[model samples]
Target chain A: QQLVAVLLNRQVANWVVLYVKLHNFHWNVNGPNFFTLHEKFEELYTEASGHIDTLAERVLSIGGSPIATLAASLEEASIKEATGGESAAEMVSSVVNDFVDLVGELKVARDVADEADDEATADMLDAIEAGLEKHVWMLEAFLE
Target chain B: SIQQLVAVLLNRQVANWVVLYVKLHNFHWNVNGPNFFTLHEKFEELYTEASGHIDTLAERVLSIGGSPIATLAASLEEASIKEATGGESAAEMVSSVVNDFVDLVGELKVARDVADEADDEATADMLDAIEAGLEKHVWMLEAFLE
Candidate 1:
């Protein structure tokens, strides 16, 4: 259970970082579609916060301390910074790539959890991976 | 103008709209407890919006001398989005959806770039519009869980 909790905590930490980055993009994005993009970014951030809480709570359930600090999130997350202001198109591209990378990481985590016989943790990661795949397609479609 | 590029972009847009529809519908159908009403209504609104966008996207394809895929088979073949198998909890559905929309927004950015390079301004513009909405939708859905 402790091992499972740690694994879940690690996943939650990654999610927290991703959520922050998404929100940052949402707040800073500018262009012809400023209003629309801004609003959307906000929406994603809100959703991410919820997931973070759920993940963290689950982690705590099994006697793990949820890594809520930014430093912990940075240490655990595999995502990269967007760096500087970018075009609306560039911003979108960066996020898509970021998500793909994250999905890959989550897949690895999922396998690790499964190997540990942590069914609940594995299930959570599985769902997250599926969602990531869908997001990749959606973002890729825009570029097509 | 490259006709194939137009076809690709059109098919891609339609696929994204369909993905959006599925995510929103899944959320609407599975949302539960306290915030059910708000979240359910919001999902419905998004689903309807995606439906409208689908029509617009298909029409754009037709205008550009391309055929938009209408059947499930075609969508499955070209779609990068995943098909849901049903029966997810409200939180799981919402979390999954946020991830899906975020990824879609990223893909659209790539498509928009391709259209721009080919001087396909019409398709680029369409992608731009869709990308903007996608970004917002992701954020809106995320807010619910936050």
Candidate 2:
């Protein structure tokens, strides 16, 4: 009955995987940019913490229970679990592209909320979308 | 202007990750057909990673001493990413992901250049790491398609 629940679940699933990915980068980042990337990764993961909760909270508000565990979210989400290690650059670069993928997702979620006539959900989705637009620019700057 | 730039982008970053997080989750659940296993895992990886980035984006904004626009009204008004549609086959998902990476990579390059011009080494460093990470995503996605 709750397609919006489907959307919120998707939101939760992605956040769960990403928290792990950022944690990987947080510890393993190396070389000249180690300090910079390391701290930044921490900040990113912390932010995810709040967002994932918000999304989950939304799920409950809309009549669904969030993913029971990481294992289930792993099966349910489009994002994959962190598989292994990589260079600091490789690790962080992976994240930037992933955020780009997210930009696509947020927009669609907004549409779904709009379709369902759920302004509250859409509003939450919208704030996230706006925040990401700027993030893409900042993250992109690091690569160059 | 650095503060302004930083503040503006930081809020947007928060918006972007959440949006993608949901979209990837949608695709992960709905993806079907032959490439389901492969694409499903890959997409999820991307989304999961995105969740992590969302945190970084907000903290960075906070670090600059600018409040991230946490309200839903602000996110909807400020973000550029459009909404997504689900129920596509594995092949279609792959195509969409590939094109998405291309578009994303292009934007990162622009952000990288902006940082360079602004002489914001701190900001540039973060972007560089993220851009480097994104390049790999784009590379893998395209390779999968090829």
Candidate 3:
């Protein structure tokens, strides 16, 4: 695979990890507003899926193997794993922090694509980075 | 047939997401002096997350047999959060976030109630999730400033 494809694959992997984490929060969240959280998580999960597909297809378009299995995705993803069984507040914090980590990874990917002169992949990563920043703000706003 | 409830939730979510994006961007652009690294990085992380959530909310609206708003014009028409201008202190930023989260929480509560009334368990479930997150966020933000 070309450098661009490799970087894009990594990007796809990053989003898949995010998608799973968000879904885990949705399914397991238990608190005063379970119903509300459940809905938001589901919505987030669905949207992540769309991004995942886009990333995967982009990777494939550039001639790369899309990480298809959960294990493969987990192995390839740069995002950290959740410790599991966190409270509602803790879960939010974890997600907020994790998103920060993901954004950093995206920057690295963006830089890699830029160095390779791969504008399309760089632009895609830019979009993802923008989205990650937004999530972090929304999550942190809750804490403030 | 809780289409209207879904529509309202989607509209509110988009508005809040836009507000969130702007808030983070403002913080990123205006944060100064000591702790700039910490706060600047944090704002960047936040704005990124909000962008993803905005996309997800719009997609969810589409999946539920409704059209999602596509333009800034549409969001401005639906959102309740006011736009911020010029430089704001850290405290002001915190206050703005808290205020927005509170409003979002309130909207989620109303959306959930409406979904429940309409027997739209799916929509209710989604609203419940949003409410839980918003409530937790509100508490955290309050603690940070207090």
Q: Model 3, residue B35: displacement in angstroms?
A: 3.3
List runs of model 2 lying over 4 Å from the truth: A1-144, B1-4, B71-73
User: In candidate 2, what are the lDDT values of residues B24-131, reduced to their tens digit?
Assistant: 665665676777788768877887787666656665665666655442334445655543554466766767766655655665566656656666667667766776
Candidate 1 residues lying further than 4 Å off, grouped into runs, are: A1-144, B1-4
Model 3 C-alpha lDDT per residue in residues B11-94, reported as the tens digit of each score = 677666755664565565555667567666766766676766676676566557665554333455577776554456776766
Provide per-model DockQ scores. 0.02, 0.04, 0.03
C-alpha lDDT (0 to 100) for residue B22 of candidate 3: 48
Better of 1 and 3 by DockQ: 3
- How many Å off is the CA of B41 in candidate 3? 2.8
Per-model TM-score on C-alpha atoms: 0.47, 0.50, 0.48
Task: For model 2 chain A, give the 10-residue run with minimal summed lDDT.
Answer: A65-74
Across A2-108, the per-residue lDDT of candidate 2 in tens digits comes to 38878777877787777756765775567998899988888887787667767876876777666534445566777654445578777766877778788798888
Candidate whose DockQ is highest: 2
Candidate 1: residue B76 lDDT (0-100) = 53
What is the Cα-based TM-score of model 2? 0.50
**lDDT by residue for model 3 (A29-63), tens:** 67896787777667766667567666766775566
lDDT of 1 by residue, B49-146 (tens): 87667667766776776656553334555777775545567777777768777877887777777777878888889878877987887787778778
Candidate 2 docking: what grade? incorrect
- Model 1 gets an lDDT of 0.66
DockQ, candidate 3, vs. native dimer: 0.03
